[PDB]
Amino acid sequence: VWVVGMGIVMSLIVLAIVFGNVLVITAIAKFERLQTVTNYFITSLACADLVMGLAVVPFGAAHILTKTWTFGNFWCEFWTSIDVLCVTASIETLCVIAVDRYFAITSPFKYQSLLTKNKARVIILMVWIVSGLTSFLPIQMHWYRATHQEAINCYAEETCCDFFTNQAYAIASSIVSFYVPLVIMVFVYSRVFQEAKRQLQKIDKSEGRHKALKTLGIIMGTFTLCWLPFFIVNIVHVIQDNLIRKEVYILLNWIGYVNSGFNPLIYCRSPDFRIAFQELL
Ligand SMILES: CN[C@@H]1CCc2c(ccc(O)c2O)[C@H]1O
Structure with a gap:
């Protein structure tokens, strides 16, 4: 059912x-x-x-x-x-x-x-x-x-199509596709937030008489929650075979797949874009 x-x-x-x-x-x-x-x-x-x-x-x-x-x-x-x-x-x-x-x-x-x-x-x-x-x-x-x-019956035969990886390829792909971007974003957004805080302090000093946290946190939370768990187990299985099971791997891949649908709302919001959407339909 x-x-x-x-x-x-x-x-x-x-x-x-x-x-x-x-x-x-x-x-x-x-x-x-x-x-x-x-x-x-x-x-x-x-x-x-x-x-x-x-x-x-x-x-x-x-x-x-x-x-x-x-x-x-x-x-x-x-x-x-x-x-x-x-x-x-x-x-x-x-x-x-x-x-x-x-x-x-x-x-x-x-x-x-x-x-x-x-x-x-x-x-x-x-x-x-x-x-x-x-x-x-x-x-x-x-x-x-x-x-x-x-899994030789998968690679060298017709019916089976499930994923199986050598030790080198998994860790290489993880290093080249996930970790370098993350180590870029963390530092760069830390610098941006520091600049914003300094500017806000200056404005408060100028005239006596928090947006940035939420604005950056929605994107960071969405991305990190979506994609981080997959690339831990991706290294783990290949490193050690006993720990993981297949269905959890598939589910963690699928929840990452959802990021494609999730992204445009986070990464696209502007009054001009709103007017453009309003004009259509
Ligand atoms: C079948 N789905 C694949 C399986 C392994 C894999 C994915 C994405 C990026 C990689 O670097 C990978 O090694 C997944 O999308």
Whole structure:
């Protein structure tokens, strides 16, 4: 009786993700006032979220609700390659957002001419290619496979498609896709908050007669709660095999998948954007 118990939520999630992504993309597309150097970065985020939601989630639902795929093996590798690429692209885009916000706040005088409209696009390219260097190239090679006899019936046979990783690839992907962005964001937002506190103290000193905490905390809480637990167990299993079970791993991956739907509300709020949404429909 759980056939409809689990799966309707998946349909709701995918529909919500698609609807959220398409509105942001068309709002950037069709209105002139929205275009800016910052919005170009969010455009890649929206496109990547739309691609991932349209690609990996609906097919993953079939794998969840049935024993295994009715599909091919190269398609299994293709799905596994798309998922990691999407996740790492999202992480890198968020890191770039934090960096450019820091450049804006800290040194306004040089910011106006630091980031030209043209050169900005270049950095986005330097994101995706880097992601590709960890997404398609190692998956198509033998690095995705494992040496242990268990799951050989998965990699070297047709029906099974579950994920199995060698020791090196898991830790390398975790180091290159999660921890470096986090160690960037923590320090950079600490500096931004210190600057904001200093400014508020100066304003209070000027004229006798907390927004920043909430504003940064919503984003930090959403991101850290969404993605941190997965990349602990990701290192752990590979480090030690006995501890974890598969279903918990899948659930922690899925709760991270929800971040794609969760993000646009946190990372997109402006009166101009509100007017643009109001104009549509
Ligand atoms: C099947 N889902 C995959 C499995 C492993 C993995 C993911 C994302 C980023 C990585 O660096 C990974 O190693 C997950 O999205």
